[PDB]
Design an enzyme around this catalytic site. Sequence first.
Site, PDB file in Angstrom:
ATOM      1  N   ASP A   1      -0.039  -7.441   0.982  1.00  0.00           N
ATOM      2  CA  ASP A   1       0.431  -6.074   1.205  1.00  0.00           C
ATOM      3  C   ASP A   1       1.964  -6.112   1.249  1.00  0.00           C
ATOM      4  OD1 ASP A   1       0.398  -3.499   1.758  1.00  0.00           O
ATOM      5  OD2 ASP A   1      -0.398  -3.207   3.687  1.00  0.00           O
TER       6      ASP A   1
ATOM      7  N   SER B   1       1.687  -3.562   7.989  1.00  0.00           N
ATOM      8  CA  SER B   1       0.663  -3.312   7.254  1.00  0.00           C
ATOM      9  C   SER B   1      -0.225  -2.493   7.819  1.00  0.00           C
ATOM     10  CB  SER B   1      -0.177  -4.557   6.757  1.00  0.00           C
ATOM     11  OG  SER B   1      -1.357  -4.240   5.724  1.00  0.00           O
TER      12      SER B   1
ATOM     13  N   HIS C   1       1.128  -1.385  -0.015  1.00  0.00           N
ATOM     14  CA  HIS C   1       0.012  -0.086  -0.068  1.00  0.00           C
ATOM     15  C   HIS C   1       0.776   1.285   0.039  1.00  0.00           C
ATOM     16  CE1 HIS C   1       0.247  -0.060   4.621  1.00  0.00           C
ATOM     17  NE2 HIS C   1       0.223   1.134   4.100  1.00  0.00           N
TER      18      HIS C   1
ATOM     19  N   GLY D   1       2.426   6.184   9.229  1.00  0.00           N
ATOM     20  CA  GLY D   1       3.857   6.568   8.914  1.00  0.00           C
ATOM     21  C   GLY D   1       4.665   5.219   9.238  1.00  0.00           C
TER      22      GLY D   1
ATOM     23  N   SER E   1       4.274   2.014   8.490  1.00  0.00           N
ATOM     24  CA  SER E   1       3.560   0.998   7.328  1.00  0.00           C
ATOM     25  C   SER E   1       4.962   0.847   6.659  1.00  0.00           C
ATOM     26  CB  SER E   1       2.855   1.481   6.165  1.00  0.00           C
ATOM     27  OG  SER E   1       1.467   1.509   7.023  1.00  0.00           O
TER      28      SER E   1
END
Lengths: 198, 4
Positions: A63, A159, A36, A141, A143
Amino acid sequence: ANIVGGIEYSINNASLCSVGFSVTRGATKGFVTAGHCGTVNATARIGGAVVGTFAARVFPGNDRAWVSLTSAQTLLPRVANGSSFVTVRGSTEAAVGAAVCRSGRTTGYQCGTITAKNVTANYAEGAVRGLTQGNACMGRGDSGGSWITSAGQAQGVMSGGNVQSNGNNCGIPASQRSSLFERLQPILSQYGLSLVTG
Amino acid sequence: AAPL
Protein backbone atom coordinates in the site's frame (compact mmCIF):
# COMPACT_ATOMS: atom_id res chain seq x y z
CA ALA A 1 1.26 24.96 -1.54
CA ASN A 2 3.44 24.13 1.43
CA ILE A 3 3.88 20.35 1.68
CA VAL A 4 3.53 19.18 5.32
CA GLY A 5 2.77 15.63 6.51
CA GLY A 6 -0.84 15.08 7.54
CA ILE A 7 -2.60 17.67 5.33
CA GLU A 8 -5.45 16.90 2.94
CA TYR A 9 -5.12 16.52 -0.81
CA SER A 10 -7.79 15.28 -3.29
CA ILE A 11 -7.37 12.81 -6.16
CA ASN A 12 -9.03 13.49 -9.51
CA ASN A 13 -11.41 15.87 -7.77
CA ALA A 14 -12.95 12.96 -5.89
CA SER A 15 -11.29 11.08 -3.02
CA LEU A 16 -9.36 12.74 -0.19
CA CYS A 17 -6.14 11.41 1.39
CA SER A 18 -3.46 12.83 3.65
CA VAL A 19 0.15 13.65 2.71
CA GLY A 20 2.70 11.22 4.27
CA PHE A 21 6.16 12.88 3.93
CA SER A 22 8.01 15.35 1.72
CA VAL A 23 10.74 13.67 -0.34
CA THR A 24 12.92 14.32 -3.34
CA ARG A 25 14.02 12.15 -6.26
CA GLY A 26 17.10 13.95 -7.69
CA ALA A 27 15.78 17.36 -8.76
CA THR A 28 12.09 16.16 -8.49
CA LYS A 29 9.96 17.08 -5.47
CA GLY A 30 7.27 14.68 -4.22
CA PHE A 31 5.48 13.27 -1.18
CA VAL A 32 4.91 9.63 -0.24
CA THR A 33 1.36 8.43 0.46
CA ALA A 34 -0.90 5.39 0.33
CA GLY A 35 -1.10 3.30 -2.86
CA HIS A 36 -4.86 2.90 -2.50
CA CYS A 37 -5.27 6.69 -2.72
CA GLY A 38 -4.77 7.01 -6.54
CA THR A 39 -3.65 5.31 -9.76
CA VAL A 40 -0.60 6.34 -11.78
CA ASN A 41 -1.20 9.72 -13.42
CA ALA A 42 -4.09 10.60 -11.09
CA THR A 43 -4.15 14.34 -10.33
CA ALA A 44 -3.36 15.59 -6.82
CA ARG A 45 -4.86 18.90 -5.65
CA ILE A 46 -4.16 20.91 -2.52
CA GLY A 47 -6.69 23.60 -1.61
CA GLY A 48 -8.15 23.43 -5.06
CA ALA A 49 -4.81 23.87 -6.93
CA VAL A 50 -3.10 21.10 -8.93
CA VAL A 51 0.25 20.24 -7.22
CA GLY A 52 1.31 17.04 -9.09
CA THR A 53 0.34 13.52 -10.15
CA PHE A 54 0.76 9.98 -8.95
CA ALA A 55 4.18 8.80 -10.25
CA ALA A 56 3.91 5.24 -9.07
CA ARG A 57 1.99 3.04 -6.73
CA VAL A 58 1.60 -0.49 -5.44
CA PHE A 59 -1.80 -1.65 -4.16
CA PRO A 60 -2.88 -4.23 -2.98
CA GLY A 61 0.08 -6.58 -2.06
CA ASN A 62 1.71 -3.41 -0.55
CA ASP A 63 0.00 0.00 0.00
CA ARG A 64 2.40 2.71 -1.28
CA ALA A 65 2.71 5.56 -3.77
CA TRP A 66 4.70 8.77 -4.40
CA VAL A 67 3.25 11.87 -6.16
CA SER A 68 5.70 13.95 -8.22
CA LEU A 69 5.09 17.64 -7.62
CA THR A 70 5.52 20.70 -9.80
CA SER A 71 8.45 23.03 -9.02
CA ALA A 72 6.42 25.68 -7.33
CA GLN A 73 5.66 23.34 -4.40
CA THR A 74 7.56 23.97 -1.17
CA LEU A 75 8.74 20.82 0.54
CA LEU A 76 8.95 21.00 4.32
CA PRO A 77 10.49 18.58 6.83
CA ARG A 78 7.37 18.77 9.05
CA VAL A 79 4.27 16.88 10.16
CA ALA A 80 1.16 18.76 11.24
CA ASN A 81 0.25 18.58 14.92
CA GLY A 82 -2.80 20.82 15.27
CA SER A 83 -1.36 24.30 14.65
CA SER A 84 2.16 23.16 15.52
CA PHE A 85 4.64 20.85 13.79
CA VAL A 86 6.77 17.76 14.42
CA THR A 87 10.15 18.09 12.65
CA VAL A 88 11.20 15.19 10.45
CA ARG A 89 14.66 14.01 11.60
CA GLY A 90 15.11 10.61 9.86
CA SER A 91 13.59 7.19 9.36
CA THR A 92 14.90 4.91 12.13
CA GLU A 93 12.27 2.18 12.48
CA ALA A 94 10.90 1.94 16.04
CA ALA A 95 10.26 -1.45 17.64
CA VAL A 96 7.14 -3.10 19.09
CA GLY A 97 6.11 -1.23 22.25
CA ALA A 98 7.46 2.15 21.06
CA ALA A 99 5.08 5.12 21.23
CA VAL A 100 4.10 6.65 17.88
CA CYS A 101 1.80 9.38 16.54
CA ARG A 102 0.02 9.71 13.19
CA SER A 103 -1.37 12.81 11.49
CA GLY A 104 -4.24 13.05 8.94
CA ARG A 105 -7.03 15.33 7.67
CA THR A 106 -9.81 13.47 9.51
CA THR A 107 -8.82 12.78 13.11
CA GLY A 108 -5.83 15.15 13.37
CA TYR A 109 -2.72 13.98 15.31
CA GLN A 110 -3.30 10.83 17.41
CA CYS A 111 -0.70 8.83 19.39
CA GLY A 112 -0.49 5.25 20.72
CA THR A 113 2.01 2.43 20.51
CA ILE A 114 3.17 -0.08 18.01
CA THR A 115 1.67 -3.47 18.84
CA ALA A 116 2.72 -5.77 16.01
CA LYS A 117 4.66 -5.93 12.73
CA ASN A 118 4.20 -7.95 9.58
CA VAL A 119 0.43 -7.94 9.74
CA THR A 120 -1.75 -8.90 6.76
CA ALA A 121 -4.95 -6.76 6.24
CA ASN A 122 -7.51 -8.53 3.98
CA TYR A 123 -8.99 -5.60 2.05
CA ALA A 124 -11.86 -6.21 -0.43
CA GLU A 125 -9.36 -5.51 -3.24
CA GLY A 126 -6.88 -8.15 -2.03
CA ALA A 127 -4.45 -8.76 0.87
CA VAL A 128 -1.81 -6.17 1.85
CA ARG A 129 1.08 -7.82 3.68
CA GLY A 130 3.86 -6.67 5.97
CA LEU A 131 1.97 -3.85 7.70
CA THR A 132 2.93 -2.64 11.19
CA GLN A 133 0.08 -2.27 13.68
CA GLY A 134 -0.38 0.56 16.16
CA ASN A 135 -3.25 1.53 18.43
CA ALA A 136 -3.45 5.26 17.73
CA CYS A 137 -7.02 5.85 16.32
CA MET A 138 -7.75 7.10 12.74
CA GLY A 139 -10.79 7.63 10.43
CA ARG A 140 -11.69 7.63 6.74
CA GLY A 141 -9.67 10.38 5.08
CA ASP A 142 -6.48 9.70 7.19
CA SER A 143 -4.95 7.20 4.68
CA GLY A 144 -1.53 8.08 3.40
CA GLY A 145 -0.89 10.29 6.44
CA SER A 146 2.34 10.25 8.42
CA TRP A 147 3.20 7.88 11.30
CA ILE A 148 6.10 9.40 13.28
CA THR A 149 7.72 9.17 16.73
CA SER A 150 7.71 12.32 18.92
CA ALA A 151 11.45 12.29 18.29
CA GLY A 152 10.97 12.91 14.54
CA GLN A 153 11.69 9.44 13.16
CA ALA A 154 9.27 8.82 10.26
CA GLN A 155 7.75 5.27 10.42
CA GLY A 156 5.31 4.88 7.53
CA VAL A 157 2.02 5.99 5.97
CA MET A 158 -1.52 5.16 6.98
CA SER A 159 -2.99 2.17 5.16
CA GLY A 160 -6.21 1.13 6.94
CA GLY A 161 -7.78 -0.60 9.96
CA ASN A 162 -10.99 -1.38 11.83
CA VAL A 163 -13.16 1.72 11.38
CA GLN A 164 -16.58 1.55 13.08
CA SER A 165 -19.90 2.89 11.76
CA ASN A 166 -18.92 6.49 12.70
CA GLY A 167 -15.98 6.31 10.27
CA ASN A 168 -13.14 6.00 12.83
CA ASN A 169 -11.84 3.73 15.59
CA CYS A 170 -11.53 6.61 18.06
CA GLY A 171 -14.72 5.55 19.94
CA ILE A 172 -13.30 2.06 20.89
CA PRO A 173 -10.58 1.43 23.47
CA ALA A 174 -6.96 1.40 22.40
CA SER A 175 -6.91 -2.31 23.17
CA GLN A 176 -9.41 -3.05 20.38
CA ARG A 177 -7.89 -0.87 17.68
CA SER A 178 -5.99 -2.24 14.70
CA SER A 179 -4.56 0.76 12.82
CA LEU A 180 -2.11 -0.37 10.07
CA PHE A 181 0.66 1.57 8.31
CA GLU A 182 3.04 0.70 5.45
CA ARG A 183 6.68 0.97 6.55
CA LEU A 184 8.53 3.99 5.00
CA GLN A 185 11.88 2.16 4.45
CA PRO A 186 10.87 -0.08 1.53
CA ILE A 187 9.02 2.84 -0.10
CA LEU A 188 12.21 5.05 -0.04
CA SER A 189 14.39 2.32 -1.49
CA GLN A 190 11.87 1.06 -4.01
CA TYR A 191 11.51 4.55 -5.55
CA GLY A 192 15.04 5.88 -4.92
CA LEU A 193 13.57 8.67 -2.70
CA SER A 194 15.26 10.77 -0.02
CA LEU A 195 13.28 12.17 2.92
CA VAL A 196 13.36 15.98 3.51
CA THR A 197 14.68 16.47 7.11
CA GLY A 198 15.17 19.51 9.38
CA ALA B 1 -10.26 -3.97 7.87
CA ALA B 2 -10.65 -1.39 5.16
CA PRO B 3 -8.29 0.99 3.37
CA LEU B 4 -8.90 4.67 4.44
